[PDB]
C-alpha cells in the first residue's frame, strides 16, 4: 500500500488516515482508498462526496468497513454536515465493501435493485433501499427520494450487469465507476463479470445520458475527459 500511494499522489491530493481526498469542484470531492491484491499489488478505488445544501451525499464506499468509517470521520471534521444517504454503483468490493460501516452510522443506503439481489452471491452486504429504472435508463424518482444534484442513470450491462452511473447537477462531473476506463488505458480491466455484447452500447449510453459532462470520474484512474468514454467504447467494440 504505502509505496504505491506515494507514486500515485499529485499536487491537489490531501491525506487523512488511510484515505486520499481530492477536491474536484467547490462541493465535490473524490475519496480514494487502497487494497493490496497479492500477485497484483495495491489498487486504488475512487468514489465521491457531494455537499448539497445542509447535508452530505456519498457515492460508493471504500474497499473496507474501517476505511469507510474513516471517510465518515473526515466528512464529520472537514465538512461537518450530516451524511443523508449513500448510493453504491454495483455489487463489488471496491464499491460496496464498506456497507456495514454506513449502516452502523445510520446512513440510508441505495443501490440498483439488481445490485442488492446480487450482493449476497458477490460477498457484499445489500443496501437498505433499491433503485429501479425506466426503459430509458433514468432512475425512477420515487425510488430515489431527495437525491439533490445526484442524477442516477443505468446505462445497461457493461462492466457488470448492475452498474449504475451518476451525474452531479450543477457541475461538469459524471461518475462512470468501473464502466469507464481512462483514455490511454491498455484494457477494460476486470471483465470477469462483463457483458461483452452490450458493453460498448452501455458505455455510449452513459456518454449520451450526460452529454455536457467534461470531467469523467472513474474507479481506477484520475478524472479524465470525454475521450475516456470514446476510448472505452472502442475497446469494447473489439469484445463483441
Ligand atoms: Cl451532461
Curated annotation (Swiss-Prot):
Zn(2+) 1 binds at residues 90, 92, 159. Binds 2 Zn(2+) ions per subunit. One of its GO terms (cellular component) is periplasmic space. Its cofactor is Zn(2+). It comes from the Bacteria. It is an enzyme of class 3 (hydrolase). Substrate binds at residues 181, 190. Its EC number is 3.5.2.6. It catalyses: a beta-lactam + H2O = a substituted beta-amino acid. GO terms for molecular function: beta-lactamase activity; zinc ion binding. Pfam families: Lactamase_B. Keywords: Antibiotic resistance, Hydrolase, Metal-binding, Periplasm, Plasmid, Signal, Zinc. It is found in: Periplasm. Zn(2+) 2 binds at residues 94, 178, 220. Confers resistance to the different beta-lactams antibiotics (penicillin, cephalosporin and carbapenem) via the hydrolysis of the beta-lactam ring. Does not confer resistance to the polymixin colistin or the fluoroquinolone ciprofloxacin. Enterobacteriaceae carrying this gene (identified by PCR) have been isolated in Sweden, India, Pakistan, Bangladesh, England, Scotland, Northern Ireland, Australia and the USA. The organisms they were identified in were K.pneumoniae, Enterobacter cloacae, E.coli, Proteus spp, Citrobacter freundii, Morganella morganii, Providencia spp and Klebsille oxytoca. In India most isolates were from community-acquired infections rather than hospital-acquired infections, indicating the gene is widespread in the environment. Belongs to the metallo-beta-lactamase superfamily. Class-B beta-lactamase family. This is Metallo-beta-lactamase type 2. It comes from Klebsiella pneumoniae. The lineage of its organism: Bacteria, Pseudomonadati, Pseudomonadota, Gammaproteobacteria, Enterobacterales. The gene is blaNDM-1.
Amino acid at each position: 500500500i504505502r509505496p504505491t500511494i506515494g507514486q500515485q499522489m499529485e499536487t491537489g491530493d490531501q491525506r487523512f488516515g488511510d484515505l486520499v481526498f481530492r477536491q474536484l469542484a467547490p462541493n465535490v470531492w473524490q475519496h480514494t482508498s487502497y487494497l493490496d491484491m497479492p500477485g497484483f499489488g495495491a489498487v486504488a478505488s475512487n468514489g465521491l462526496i457531494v455537499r448539497d445544501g445542509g447535508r452530505v451525499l456519498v457515492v460508493d464506499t471504500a474497499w473496507t468497513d474501517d476505511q469507510t468509517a474513516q471517510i465518515l470521520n473526515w466528512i464529520k471534521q472537514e465538512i461537518n454536515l450530516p451524511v443523508a444517504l449513500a448510493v453504491v454503483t454495483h455489487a463489488h468490493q471496491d464499491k460496496m465493501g464498506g456497507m456495514d460501516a454506513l449502516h452502523a452510522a445510520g446512513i440510508a443506503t441505495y443501490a440498483n435493485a439488481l445490485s442488492n439481489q446480487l450482493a449476497p452471491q458477490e460477498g457484499m452486504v445489500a443496501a437498505q433501499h433499491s433503485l429501479t429504472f425506466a426503459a430509458n435508463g433514468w432512475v425512477e424518482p420515487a425510488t430515489a427520494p431527495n437525491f439533490g444534484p445526484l442524477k442516477v442513470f443505468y446505462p445497461g450491462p457493461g462492466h457488470t450487469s448492475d452498474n449504475i452511473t451518476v451525474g452531479i447537477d450543477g457541475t461538469d462531473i459524471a461518475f462512470g465507476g468501473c464502466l469507464i476506463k481512462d483514455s490511454k488505458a491498455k484494457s477494460l480491466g476486470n471483465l470477469g463479470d462483463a457483458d461483452t455484447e452490450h458493453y460498448a452500447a452501455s458505455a455510449r449510453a452513459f456518454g449520451a445520458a450526460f452529454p455536457k459532462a467534461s470531467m469523467i470520474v472513474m474507479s481506477h484512474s484520475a478524472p479524465d475527459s470525454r475521450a475516456a468514454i470514446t476510448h472505452t467504447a472502442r475497446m469494447a467494440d473489439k469484445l463483441r
